[PDB]
Design a protein around this ligand. Structure first.
Ligand SMILES: COc1ccc(OC)c(Sc2ccc3nnc(-c4cnn(C)c4)n3n2)c1
Length: 290
């Protein structure tokens, strides 16, 4: 609803960038003095196609209506005359993503489980608003402070139709396949349970402290190999069908690993929902906190 004026926007640094999306840090200072607020601005590349342009408007509209303690705060929008679209203005989460934070800061198991609990609370809220995230990964989880985490990029987020239990995707080259459930890779159908599979992968990332050598693409590519022509996805689909999974991270308790494996049930309906996960993680965090 809010309109940011381009004349008070001052670019500080780039924060992240993909194939069609880009996030940069700006100071919004309508006094040219001190009081200036720090904002994260997402822009769509002017070269993006009509599917990405219509999907960009869908993204702004999803975030314009979402409001939760564990979801990034929508600030407003400013015109991007340079791209003939809009720029998405969000609050700046200063400690950044868990992907950049965890390899640099030794975080105890207790705090990691609190983050996992917070991720599920934000995801359950998203699912109650009938939206699927489709890109749940540690790179998309933002650290506000030592005890606050927020879900941050809604670039693939979709509305689940009223009469359906899933959304049909039709796969692209930018799909985060190493965080995807077998039904996504094989049938191109994204269920609410498909986001729970991705959370399982996120939970694995958190427990490995986002170590690159232990990351899902590294680990799965060690199992598949790199001389597979166009068949990486097919080889991943069959290893998952054989019941092969990411290993137990060093120092991850057995029960937390069992919960991870429960999120990785081949059969989507055998997975817990985010609402089911919230009291389980509440109790597992209470345990390890003491
Ligand atoms: C185009 O790509 C992205 C990628 C990741 C995102 O969330 C992780 C977002 S929304 C968003 C909102 C507030 C915020 N404060 N910092 C960051 C931030 C830091 N690193 N990165 C990559 C984003 N954000 N990001 C958009």
């Amino acid at each position: 609803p809010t309109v940011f004026h381009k004349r008070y926007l001052k670019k500080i640094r780039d924060l992240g960038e993909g194939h069609f999306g880009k996030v940069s840090l700006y100071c919004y200072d309508p006094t040219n003095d001190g009081t200036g607020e720090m904002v994260a601005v997402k822009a769509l590349k002017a070269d993006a196609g009509p599917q990405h342009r219509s999907g960009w408007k869908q993204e702004i509209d999803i975030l314009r209506t979402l409001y939760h303690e564990h979801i990034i705060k929508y600030k407003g929008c400013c015109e991007d005359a340079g791209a003939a679209s809009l720029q998405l203005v969000m609050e700046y989460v200063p400690l950044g993503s868990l992907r950049d934070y965890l390899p640099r800061h030794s975080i105890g198991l207790a705090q990691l489980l609190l983050f996992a609990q917070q991720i599920c609370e934000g995801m359950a809220y998203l699912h109650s608003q009938h939206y699927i995230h489709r890109d749940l990964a540690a790179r998309n989880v933002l650290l506000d402070n030592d005890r606050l985490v927020k879900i941050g990029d809604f670039g693939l987020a979709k509305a689940v139709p009223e009469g359906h239990e899933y959304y049909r995707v039709r796969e692209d080259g930018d799909s985060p396949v190493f965080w995807y459930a077998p039904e996504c890779l094989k049938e191109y159908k994204f269920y609410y349970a498909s986001d729970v599979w991705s959370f399982g992968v996120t939970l694995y990332e958190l427990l490995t402290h986002c170590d690159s050598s232990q990351s899902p693409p590294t680990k799965f590519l060690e199992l598949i190999g790199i001389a597979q022509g166009q068949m990486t996805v097919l080889r991943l689909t069959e290893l998952l069908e054989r019941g092969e999974r990411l290993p137990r991270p060093d120092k991850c308790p057995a029960e937390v690993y069992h919960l991870m494996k429960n999120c990785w049930e081949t059969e989507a309906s055998f997975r817990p929902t985010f609402e089911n996960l919230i009291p389980i993680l509440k109790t597992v965090h209470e345990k390890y906190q003491g």
